RNA sequence: GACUCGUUCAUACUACAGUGGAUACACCAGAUCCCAUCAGAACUCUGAAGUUAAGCACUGUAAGGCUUGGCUAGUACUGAGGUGGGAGACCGCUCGGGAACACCAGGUGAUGAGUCAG
RNA sequence: GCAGAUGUCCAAAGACAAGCUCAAAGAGAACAGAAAUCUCUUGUAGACUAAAAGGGGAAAAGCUUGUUUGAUUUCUAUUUUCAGAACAAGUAGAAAACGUGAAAGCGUGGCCUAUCGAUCCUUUAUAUUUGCAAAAUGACGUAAAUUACUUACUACUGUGCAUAUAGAGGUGUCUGAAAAGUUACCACAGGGAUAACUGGCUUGUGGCUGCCAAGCGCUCCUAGCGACGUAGCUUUUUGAUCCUUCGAUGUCGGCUCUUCCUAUCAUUGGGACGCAGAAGUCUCAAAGUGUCGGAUUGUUCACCCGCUAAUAGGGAACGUGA
RNA sequence: AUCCGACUGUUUAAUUAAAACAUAGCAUUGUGAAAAGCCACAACUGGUAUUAACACAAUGUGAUUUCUGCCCAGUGCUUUGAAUGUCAACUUGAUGAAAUUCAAUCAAGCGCAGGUAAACGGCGGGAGUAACUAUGACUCUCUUAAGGUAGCCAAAUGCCUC
RNA sequence: CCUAUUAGCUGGUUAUUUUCGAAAGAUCUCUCAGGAUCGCUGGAGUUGAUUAAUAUAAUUUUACCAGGUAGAGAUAAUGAUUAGAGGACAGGGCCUUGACCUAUUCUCAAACUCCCAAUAGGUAAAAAGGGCGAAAUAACUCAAUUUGUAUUUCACUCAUAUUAAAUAAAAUAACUCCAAGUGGGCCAUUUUUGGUAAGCAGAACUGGCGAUGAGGGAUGCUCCUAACGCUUGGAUAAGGUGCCUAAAUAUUCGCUCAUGAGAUCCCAUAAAAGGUGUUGGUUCAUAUGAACUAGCCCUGAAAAUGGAUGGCGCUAAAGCGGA
RNA sequence: ACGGACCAAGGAGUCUAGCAAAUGUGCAAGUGUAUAUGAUUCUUUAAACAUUUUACGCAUAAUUAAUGUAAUAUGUCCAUUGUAGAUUUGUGCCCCACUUUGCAUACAAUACCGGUAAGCAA
RNA sequence: GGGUAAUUGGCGCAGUUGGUUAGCGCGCGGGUCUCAUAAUCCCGAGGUCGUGAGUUCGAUCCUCACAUUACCCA
């Protein structure tokens, strides 16, 4: 029995049917295998930035907790 | 029956007329920055490093920039949905777009304006005009000027 | 395809230094008797039934890939691929 | 006037004539050493006796080409509508958008950074 | 559908660097010619680039030379087919040690687009990684101690076997069953998704009617014709399709019987003719009347004998099996 | 009168009575007996057989007449094998601490060398040539195993064919 | 008896109403009548809106992009392809044959392109953001622990009162989970492949049919108007106004004699060629001759049950084309 | 195109095991009381009731073939860090802008455990 | 795959450490009349490469080149 072999009717309706959906668009992308050696000082900095925040933090937790 | 990489492109792969030869010695130049929009555009003068079929003439941000490879992000569609997808490409085809600088125009006009205005205090239709209807006036035209017209015969 | 005998290339074990390696090509080597499947197999053919197993008996594609082994002349060994091709040997005239 | 490094990558090109030589580039003298060949022709090295003849710079050609503008022409063409016309092929109308080739006119560049010379 | 091609080939046809610039045409020079070597002039590819085709390529991606093997180990982000699975093929990187040039860089095979393959099983390599279910196999090795069931410290621990990682052995029906025919003795479930018969829509072929007029017709284009070309009707042949029925529409032909159509064979009345008359040819109005007996053959179709006035062409589910 | 079948006979109960079968004749093969043939049987055992080559079993063709031409390359079937290629178990021997791994051969069969076509079957293609013409008695040629012999015919076997 | 064997296949598969409501693609399949898969749908539940915003939009605009289809060409390349004008290697008797060269000429290319549309395509149009300086951090980079890069915290503040263009019954959103059907399609305007053509075979953007009736086309699965809760009035769409058949023998302006007139797209055929029929024009010649030109009409025009603009019939139309 | 001359009765998505999801309920780092045990229960009672100070299943911790190994790390009963984000306390008993807390979740970043690489390696 | 012979003159042939040899195919001479034929000589990677040994085609060894066998978890 002749099949037929191919069509796209009625396609782009039942895409537009539901809508045309969006990516969500989150704000950060990972980073888990781009450009290495730049974020690898980069997660450095971070640890670094993070370590003095908090200390002073605790300094001044203990400071004002006596 | 055949759907390999570079099909269909023998005229849209091809470079213009009289526009031969290696891709001009100073778009190695350009400066790019994480967050800036780009065209992408397929050279054929390079080779490897190169773009896919349906790439070819859309646009992007860039988000991966290696020694000599760009990451571009873009919106590829497929049938009922819209979904990122990141192409790797080189700096000889990759190009710097102008899609953003209207925008960025218009944003330094407004720093250069608003400013004063708010020292002014005044306010203003800072939204873009889109010239809709004209206003009405009055104008001349002497009678020495003016060329009727009435439709042709035939020949 | 003629390929020189004895290269200088890096060694991917117990040693990190680009010296001299011999080529040779692999062969398959004659099966084991004592080996698992060969003794499985012989269980299951015991008794009546005859075959209990496919032959892979279509023989399509007319060549076999190429496989050069790489002898570390400090020691030990490592494999090689090339693509496939009819006709190979070993430092045939220039 | 001159050069060096660039951009623009033919208005910057090409053919033919004329003009310009203090440093300028350049032709030019040579091959012991660095250096290369079949050949000091090329390349490399050392020089400045002679030099606008040539390249290079400028100008000229009812020069070809190139490049703008006009015209080709609202023509060819085409989106939407039509219980429009035509046996059909095709051709109108409303709302719309809009060519090219050939032809004519004008032109043969602009330019950044740095230096020498007076 | 169309024009083709692939299941290979290559230590260089791979990598890099450097130098040079190809075909062709003209001009010239012993043998020497259309072609043989050299040199000159012009020369944006008209050659060359493994293959078919399509792109790209000029101080090169081509030609010559030089040094070389990055055609290497391991791992990510991803693009094409897309389920946005994979493999595959790529693209961009990273951690290594290299080659190349002076460096900048470039190198993860072939300037780009095709050149290829799961599970399980087998085999070969790698491994300060393991077991072979109460135990051990260097080795009693080393330090002390005595005639013993002595004590501390050991990375190098029997054959064979299974694993872990990595390639390879092919599944071309190529996302992967190990596989010869026949039923005219047949059986079953189904199919008008699907043949053979009408019916249908189309008219290529068949038949029929035209248009134009070079020539034929003693001269004379149209009495009768009419090539070379061109426009239509037909469903009476064969075609093309498979829209209707395979829970059955009784499929050839002959016998018999009725009507209908006209593109008239004869008969009616005319017209024309290259018509003396006769005979005959073309043709307009015309379906009222008529279109036969036989031999051969299953025939339709066909060919003969004979009379005829003439022995015209067709349909009706190829008319007609209660 | 022709074709078929030699005749009498038998057969598709209920679509086919024949040209189908069988028969007499012709010819082949196996078989010397209980250690054989053909066959049945799970094993014991049995039929042929109360049998003995003028017999038993399996075959093709089908009175009588005259014939029954050629090929053992193909496939079958069969005959000889201590020279013999290949080839199992077992056994022997070697190494090994043992499993193990290795070599050797006087099994049959296949191969080697024969025979057999009333075993299955097969039986050519091109050119040139003779006082008219046409053909080809013959010559050359490619090739197979031989290349359709005696005979016969648009036969119930010839499409072209009416 | 195993056995109520198996069956990708045929037939059947029982009460209402309401709400929502499809597909006949695409990948793989010893697959082509099946199946798994996403795609389309329902149900459930959650986060965000309820503040004429922000996300969002089969939308347009402003800016900026990319293409090589029609079209246009042959002198712009390649391949064709027709004739001459002119001009300095070979053949024979200044002469001839050609080839060859310069500029012209006739016509082309789904697998030609110096050029290039409309359609269709893409991106940006400001707050989880940006602009403008300091202070820290790093093992990254740079000659630069201070060159920068990226990050954090502070400064300062960028239309926000219409809202960084317009307009938006834009939060009827977004997400997650469970699941059925589906996986043979077809018709239509336009584009287009094969074939002569087909109510054929095969594709393309869109709409329908299927899944759907209502009015009209006499009648019809797809045409036109228009999509449906149950009634009462008004006014319409398409379409009609001689009767059938509800409404104009309505008005007004011209054409038409048919001894086979004509009367709606799909839609149910008609041509090449003609006409001294008639109506109106144009070009020429001295109200006349010719040559053209387009409306209607006539010929061309032949098929079988008896036959159809739907019938009747229709001519100062109830035909044709208008107002 | 196929089944239906007619009537009345019968006539078809059920049951079980296992899993998942949705919903409701109890309990909650525990949960279920299994076989079975005791009782002046012993028509109905083949059901209800009850279960002396680790029985098991499922969960609390994963991962690798595997010998096995096993989640910050003792500065502190803070309980990792960001961007938004529901609430919340207040300034200008009902809006918006200003600081305060930052649920859930969403997108990331960090550490830490097993595994495999790589460097070292007694 | 195993196992074996074969491929060396132009035919075909077998040979093995102190070796390249012939019957035929070819050349001419000479010859016994015309044919045979003594003998010179054309003819040899001893299928290929490498290896073993005072001494090799030979001894060891792999590459493909030819054919019945046997297994086709390949």
Do not use: W
């Amino acid at each position: 029995a002749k099949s037929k072999n191919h069509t796209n009717h009625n396609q782009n309706r039942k895409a537009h049917k539901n809508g045309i959906k969006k990516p969500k668009k989150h704000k950060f992308m990972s980073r888990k295998g781009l450009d290495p050696n730049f974020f690898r000082n980069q997660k450095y900095c971070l640890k670094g930035i993070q370590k003095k925040k908090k200390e002073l933090k605790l300094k001044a937790k203990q400071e004002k907790n006596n | 029956k055949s759907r390999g990489k570079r099909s269909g492109t023998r005229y849209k792969f091809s470079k213009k007329f009289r526009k031969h030869g290696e891709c001009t010695a100073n778009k190695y130049l350009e400066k790019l920055n994480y967050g800036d929009y780009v065209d992408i555009v397929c050279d054929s003068t390079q080779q490897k490093g190169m773009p896919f079929n349906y790439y070819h003439g859309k646009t992007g941000k860039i988000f991966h920039i290696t020694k000599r490879g760009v990451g571009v992000l873009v919106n590829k569609r497929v049938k009922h949905r819209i979904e990122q997808k990141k192409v790797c490409v080189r700096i000889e085809h990759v190009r710097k777009s102008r899609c953003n600088e209207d925008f960025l125009l218009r944003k330094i006009k407004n720093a250069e304006l608003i400013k004063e205005a708010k020292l002014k205090n005044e306010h203003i239709n800072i939204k873009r005009k889109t010239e809709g209807p004209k206003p009405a006036a009055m104008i001349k035209v002497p009678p020495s000027k003016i060329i009727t017209i009435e439709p042709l015969p035939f020949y | 395809v003629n390929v020189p005998k004895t290269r200088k290339t890096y060694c991917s074990n117990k040693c990190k230094k680009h010296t001299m390696h011999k080529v040779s090509q692999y062969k398959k080597g004659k099966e084991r008797l004592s080996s698992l499947g060969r003794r499985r197999y012989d269980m299951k053919q015991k008794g009546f039934g005859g075959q209990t197993k496919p032959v892979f008996k279509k023989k399509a594609k007319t060549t076999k890939k190429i496989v050069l082994k790489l002898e570390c002349t400090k020691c030990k060994k490592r494999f090689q691929t090339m693509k496939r091709c009819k006709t190979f040997e070993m430092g045939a005239d220039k």
